[PDB]
Amino acid sequence: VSPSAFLEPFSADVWVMMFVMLLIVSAVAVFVFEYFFTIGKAIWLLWGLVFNNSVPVQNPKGTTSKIMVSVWAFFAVIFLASYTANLAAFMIQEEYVDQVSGLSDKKFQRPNDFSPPFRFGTVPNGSTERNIRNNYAEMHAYMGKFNQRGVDDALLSLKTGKLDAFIYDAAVLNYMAGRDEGCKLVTIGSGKVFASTGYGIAIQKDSGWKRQVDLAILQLFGDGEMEELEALWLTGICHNEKNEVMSSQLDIDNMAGVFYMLGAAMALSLITFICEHLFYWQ
Amino acid sequence: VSPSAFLEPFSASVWVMMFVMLLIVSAIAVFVFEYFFTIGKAIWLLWGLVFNNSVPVQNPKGTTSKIMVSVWAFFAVIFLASYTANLAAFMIQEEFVDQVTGLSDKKFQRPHDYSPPFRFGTVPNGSTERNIRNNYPYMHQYMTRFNQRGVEDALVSLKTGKLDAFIYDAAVLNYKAGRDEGCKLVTIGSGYIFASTGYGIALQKGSPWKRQIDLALLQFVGDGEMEELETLWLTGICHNEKNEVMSSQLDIDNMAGVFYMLAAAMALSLITFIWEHLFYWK
Amino acid sequence: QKCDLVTTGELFFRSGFGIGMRKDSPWKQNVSLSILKSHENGFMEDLDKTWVRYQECDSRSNAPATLTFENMAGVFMLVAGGIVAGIFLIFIEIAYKRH
Amino acid sequence: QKCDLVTTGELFFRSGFGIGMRKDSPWKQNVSLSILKSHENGFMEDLDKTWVRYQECDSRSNAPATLTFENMAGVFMLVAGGIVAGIFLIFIEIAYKRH
Amino acid sequence: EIPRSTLDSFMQPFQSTLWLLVGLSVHVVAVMLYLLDRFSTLSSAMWFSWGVLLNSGIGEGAPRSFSARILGMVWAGFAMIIVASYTANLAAFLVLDRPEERITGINDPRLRNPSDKFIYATVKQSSVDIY
Amino acid sequence: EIPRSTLDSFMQPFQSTLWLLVGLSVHVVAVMLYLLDRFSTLSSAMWFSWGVLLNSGIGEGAPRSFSARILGMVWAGFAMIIVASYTANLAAFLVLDRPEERITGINDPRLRNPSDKFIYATVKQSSVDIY
């Protein structure tokens, strides 16, 4: 949940139109009073009516303007209903965070710029180790501390928190991901790959078959049998993703916006106390 | 929306449990107040604290019992939040009435018994007319007025609700409901139709082709290419799950329970006033 | 029939129940003709109504699973603690009026 | 780049680009070898960084359609109309409050 | 697509006829409460009733009888039936709202039915053209 | 399957430490308001602090100082925020707690993927077995 998510549901324009409407109704109330005790507390009464009628108020003023404060109560109740409805709608969010965009991420090339540092893994002594060693020696040296034993070992380490990201050959990675027992893991970029390569067929040196098999494979690509072949073979039913996750017990990190506002409010109270201390002679 | 939706978030369990707690906590509050007959107003106070501020009343007594009133209000706000949450979920749905279980529904036999009269028609001059005349004579007499000039005429009538239902060949209506715009038409029965027959291939009488044709058709049905051809050419279009259509303004026809509560309150208040005026000699 | 079990999914492999007989049986043509005539006149409708559509117990359009006892029963538990504060009443004096 | 146009659809017709050239000309094997070498040593990655991914700006966590001035703001105007009625009722008060 | 919550006015949860019905109901109920004080101040009771629906703390008029006591009981219950209905209706309408979504792929049947309301094309004589 | 909506207690929507932290913070701010005015009541401060968050009828006085008005209005804001958060979270969880799917059909993942925890079978030597 975004820490400030409670303020998105309303635009700032109406967020200040409500304040200016409070100002105009306070002006109406004080103009009603001018014909003759709540001048300093009228704004407080209106505010308490806006949020919750749980604060004692010196309300009886302007029996003709009590219709006005009833209209204000109408605005307040419809506003509270609207705010609760909007706050609900913002909290059926589909789960999505994404921690990696690609191997060229700042997180990869700068693994130690985080606390805890961003940990990724690969199987040592593989061709991917050769590639990373020849292409990027620094992050490979950083990997030297995060060696991996096996594919299932990497799976268990990722599940048990011993690892955060894995580096390995793409096709087997996708096959394993689509056939996880709960599909609790994900791939990257839907196929935005580093050091892209393909799986193909091996032919004798410059045989006459090469052309025919090339055209045959291109034909089967054009006809469209392949897409359903990997749909039936190396994909899964639940391969795509899961649905929205329930909002757990609200974390202080999700609700820290109101804590920050409380700190700002107490600071403002302190500075107003100081101002009164400088302006208590009148 | 269910007319009894407001009583849905009240099982018998929560109703009796909450009311018996109301009575027992009223008793405990009044016997605590006896230290520090106002006992008849404590129930007013507690029902208000369940609901909201009702009217200026004598709550502050027994400063330690204010903690009990506070925890009671804590339970009250929990209860109001739960009521809001449970009512919110119970009016979000799309409901398919299941208006008909088949042409043998008792609604068909007595069209006039429902207001407005049940207006369903069929295309005349066809085999359906002969079948309905030979099977359901009075039904045919009542159909004599509901004939439709063409298939598209009745389709348009159903689109704008001129007719309540349409009677015709099963497969063609399935096909029309398939490619119909917006999926406003529904075919019913899952095969439960009167004179359930099938389309087929005709042959010259006693031709040697019967055995081969039948064996090929059964082989095609068994292995599953038959329904693949079906989906290729038949009504795969639409086939969507009607999850939720926008819950319109909750009308009096839907929330008449509140007016029924109002009438019950009127009658009960009049009865109680009569009983009170009866007891005027003391 | 019982309302403890439910069908699910969408029907597949549409076939037809049929009376099978030995290939050389001379009754085939008339059996088929009579079965079609029974389909046409509505006798099959009567037999279906009298032996298929009992529907003596029906359930459909599942409800959104309203609240129950246990899902907030523990809430009630907390108010019990309030009663404990009540038996503190006398010590309130010892707590406050003496101090 | 633009961030107001969004791509969609799963990758169908999974294929690859390629520099096409006449059958009889001899660079083909050397061209393919050089392309594979560039793929291996990350030169193609440098090209992708230089000309493909440089600004990102990818829309994420689609907004749930917040409320803005449009539906409620005019409501203020509507209730503002009610204020006009109040301006009558205070003057009517002058007719009523005097006696 | 720009996310925005389309909405006409606060009338959306309930038809204006129902608003008129409840507006007359509150006043007729208040009149009934005032008139039952025969064998027990119209302005006090009427303002009290019309503010109870509106949750406003203003209003000191209060019933003194038990019949009007139960009437106020059920009136507060009623008023919060309205407010709960309002919040539920608005929450449901907002949750279902903006349900439009981009095309998930060519397999979407929307592509299979051509229309002026649903047009899609490409570059002529391209690879996808012969495809 | 008999449907049932899970809810452990009143503690299901909120983290356990939330109530303790808000209860200590409200006491701290009440003490802050109480102490710093004399150099130029606690029971009333306590009643405001508890009841205003709990939306109770308790509390009949008014705070003596001037910035106490600002503190009270921001505290009412906090109260409306927290109550709205609880209501919205409870509604969202009570909507999104429906039981798992009831087998889509032949294409159901629990059917397409055999699992020892979900065992299904039919009658031996029947037409379905041949199919």
Ligand SMILES: *[C@@H]1O[C@H](CO)[C@@H](O[C@@H]2O[C@H](CO)[C@@H](O[C@H]3O[C@H](CO)[C@@H](O)[C@H](O)[C@@H]3O)[C@H](O)[C@H]2NC(C)=O)[C@H](O)[C@H]1NC(C)=O
């Ligand atoms: C199938 O049902 C048919 C119903 O019409 C039936 O047709 C008629 O059947 C009767 C007797 O079954 C025949 O009557 C014949 O019976 C004597 C037997 O001694 C014959 O010698 C006579 O020729 C006499 O006609 C009808 O002739 C016959 N009608 C026709 C048009 O064939 C079939 O016989 C039934 N077939 C089976 C295999 O059940």
Ligand SMILES: *[C@@H]1O[C@H](CO)[C@@H](O[C@@H]2O[C@H](CO)[C@@H](O[C@H]3O[C@H](CO)[C@@H](O)[C@H](O)[C@@H]3O)[C@H](O)[C@H]2NC(C)=O)[C@H](O)[C@H]1NC(C)=O
């Ligand atoms: C494709 O790349 C090949 C790189 O291996 C290249 O083969 C190399 O070609 C050079 C010159 O064509 C040969 O070098 C020769 O240079 C002088 C004069 O040409 C000779 O006297 C030397 O003895 C020496 O052989 C390389 O030997 C030769 N290497 C191999 C492994 O074949 C091809 O020419 C390139 N072809 C195209 C079409 O680009």
Ligand SMILES: *[C@@H]1O[C@H](CO)[C@@H](O[C@@H]2O[C@H](CO)[C@@H](O)[C@H](O)[C@H]2NC(C)=O)[C@H](O)[C@H]1NC(C)=O
């Ligand atoms: C259906 O067939 C009947 C014949 O049984 C047609 O009946 C005619 O109906 C028109 C009225 O539109 C009369 O003017 C004729 O006198 C009728 N003729 C006969 C011989 O009955 C009817 O037109 C046909 N309708 C359709 C839609 O095919």
Ligand SMILES: O=C(O)[C@H]1CN(CCCP(=O)(O)O)CCN1
């Ligand atoms: O063509 C091949 O030989 C295989 C090789 N496989 C390598 C597996 C990764 P590593 O070697 O452990 O780093 C990937 C699929 N293709």
Ligand SMILES: O=C(O)[C@H]1CN(CCCP(=O)(O)O)CCN1
């Ligand atoms: O085999 C045929 O002849 C056609 C007949 N069609 C008749 C449709 C009903 P009606 O007779 O037109 O009212 C249905 C499809 N098959």
Ligand SMILES: *[C@@H]1O[C@H](CO)[C@@H](O)[C@H](O)[C@H]1NC(C)=O
């Ligand atoms: C390769 O890694 C394995 C552990 O997975 C290790 O036992 C082996 O000695 C290593 N060999 C080399 C050359 O690194």
